[PDB]
Amino acid sequence: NREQVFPTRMTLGLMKTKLKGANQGYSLLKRKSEALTKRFRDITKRIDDAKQKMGRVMQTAAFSLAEVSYATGENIGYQVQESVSTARFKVRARQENVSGVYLSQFESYIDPEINDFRLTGLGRGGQQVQRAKEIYSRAVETLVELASLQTAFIILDEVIKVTNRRVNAIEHVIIPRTENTIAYINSELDELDREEFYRLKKVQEKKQNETAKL
Amino acid sequence: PVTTATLGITQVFWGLDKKLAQRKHFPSINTSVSYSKYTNVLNKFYDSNYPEFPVLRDRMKEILSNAEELEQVVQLVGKSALSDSDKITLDVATLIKEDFLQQNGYSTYDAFCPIWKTFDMMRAFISYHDEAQKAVANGANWSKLADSTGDVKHAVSSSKFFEPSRGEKEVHGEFEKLLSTMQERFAES
Amino acid sequence: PVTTATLGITQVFWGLDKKLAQRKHFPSINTSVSYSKYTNVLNKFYDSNYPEFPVLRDRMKEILSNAEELEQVVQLVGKSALSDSDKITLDVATLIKEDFLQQNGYSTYDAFCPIWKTFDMMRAFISYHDEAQKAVANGANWSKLADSTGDVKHAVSSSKFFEPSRGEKEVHGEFEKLLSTMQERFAE
Amino acid sequence: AEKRTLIAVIADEDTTTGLLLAGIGQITPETQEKNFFVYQEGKTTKEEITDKFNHFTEERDDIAILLINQHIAENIRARVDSFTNAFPAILEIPSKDHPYDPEKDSVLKRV
């Protein structure tokens, strides 16, 4: 229930400083948890909105792809799979510092080396294929933003969990153990002071008796 | 001052913890602070009678110390981050503290646990820990492994009830079958 | 009680730092607990010889105190989100602790750091801190700025190695050249 | 991490074709691996889909964002739940004639 520290005048001061530091850390960590939790509710609302928007965009892109396939008269899936040597779109992670944490946010990019699509050799419906490709690229950008927000959500949830765990651990173990150690050290110092007082009282009584005899 | 002087003069320190005195964990010997300076000089008797006894007690001390450190970690940072080996260490140390170390002094079975029964019990607990560690190192998930080998774990936890009045031979026969029934169950899972 | 009485009756008190002594940082003099009540009367000598010296030592103490507070907060909260100026203060005070306050009494270069050399080193350190703060306030990222000005940081850290045997003119001349490259190298 | 720079698509044939047209996926010739592997309910099996998802999440370290169809994720719900790691991200994009289910979303379940 308390730290096994040998009582001392310096040890009492060191443990009082440790208690003050633990209280300060507990207050600052609670403030950090509160701020991160406010950002967490904001991120959850953004995730819900982005999920709805991504569903709508995916439905629109599916409709556009179906229209393009109908115009072309055949499935362009085989051609797309054949022309999959390199990816025109790439995502580079960016370590944005949101509040106290540094949760990463993905950033999309376009590579023009293999930017050519499967429009050639599709037979017909080149304009429809281009429109479907543009819609799919827009939906991919929206999904990349949603995935970046999702990763930020996961990282922020982990950081909030560990921060609240540390806050509860401090407030329920470190502060009580340090306070009990302070009380025990103060009690032991009081006992030592009482022993010294009693020894000095014996010395004084002996001196008084000797003076009375002489 | 009396305690400090007695610790200075004596050679064996059976420190009792009131935390274990409560919750009826007797004997309440505090394994952390307790020591015995006759461990080394008893090596002759142990080599004569029970050669593996010092090795088993060293292994039990290592398990208990590792679990004490892991529990000090867990009480602050939760038990989720632990590895499967740490899970095994904590589980087997709880088993040791609840079955082997704790000995009810007013029950017929554990009123007097002689040296041969104690040695066989150490063999059982250490072999259970080693089998769990080996089976998890082979790749088994510890949760499913414990669910499967709960029978062996409870057989080890029930080793206390082997009455020493049955005799050295009869009790040793019951412990020999315990180890054989332990390896097969862990091999099966 | 003897230390308490001495604190009551004395005018200067150089305080032992247990933390600095455990890291074998010599001299292990606690900056927070120590004091010197002779600065007010020694202001006359400082104005006579080295006019800007007291301002520089107050700046150094301010930097060390701010870094102590920020280091406590860093130990508390992991230093995940630190302002650029706060990182500048921490780095500058770590440099000050490692190079200026710390000196090998048995080393030939730092056996006896004269008052003029100490003033020049303080000029160098405070100018480095001020230049870094101004550069970051202009908008430069601290990480890239430190990567670029590692040469200047090494120069000020190695300024303690300037042998005082070369004389006041030679040592102070090199410090002025070191101070000159401070502004030129911090332009980028 | 900076090494993970790719888009993973394990959705239906139409969604995979759309992602390929947008340029999300790629097939590495040197590594003989495709970032976007076409897989449907009829194609392969649930175990094969789960193995491919696990390879994309762990073996394919270049993959940073994974797009999995809701129908595909329905049979790989256990794998999606087990993939609690933040990187790579997992998104339950709806497939053709399969509307997105908020309940079936792994991250939305954590909410």
Strand content of chain D: 15-25%
In N-to-C order, the SSE pattern of chain A is: HHEEH
Structural class per helix/strand content of chain A?
mainly alpha
User: What count of helical segments of chain A does DSSP give?
Assistant: 3
Report the major sheet of chain D: 3 strands, parallel
Query: Structurally, how many domains make up the residues of chain D?
Result: 1
The proportion of residues in beta strands of chain A is 5-15%
What's the multimeric state?
Answer: part of a larger assembly
Number of strands of chain D: 5
Morphology call of chain D: globular
- The helical percent of chain D reads 25-40%
What is the β-strand count of chain A?
2
- What is the top-level CATH class of chain A? Mainly Alpha
The neighbouring-strand order within the major sheet of chain D is: 1-4-5
Tell me the distance between the termini of chain A.
55 Å
PDB class: hydrolase
Keywords: hydrolase
Entry title: V1 complex lacking subunit C from Saccharomyces cerevisiae, State 3
Chain A: V-type proton ATPase subunit D
Describe this structure in words.
The structure is cut from a larger assembly and holds one copy of chain A (214 residues), two copies of chain B and one copy of chain D (111 residues). Chain A has 214 residues and is mainly alpha-helical. Chain A has one domain (9-213): Helix Hairpins (Orthogonal Bundle). Chain A has three helices and two strands, in the order ααββα. In chain A, helix 1 (9-72) packs antiparallel against helix 3. With 189 residues, chain B is mostly helical. Chain B has one domain (37-189). Helix content of chain B is 63%, strand content 2%. Chain B is built from nine helices and two strands. Chain B has helices at 2-9, 18-21, 43-49, 53-77, 84-100, 115-137, 142-148, 150-157, 168-188, and strands spanning 12-13, 35-36. Chain B has a two-stranded antiparallel sheet. The longest helix of chain B is centred in the middle third of the chain and has 25 residues, at 53-77. A three-stranded parallel sheet of chain D has the order 1-4-5. In chain D, strands 2-3 form a two-stranded antiparallel ribbon. Chain D is α/β, with parallel strands linked by helices. Chains in contact: A-B, A-C, A-D.
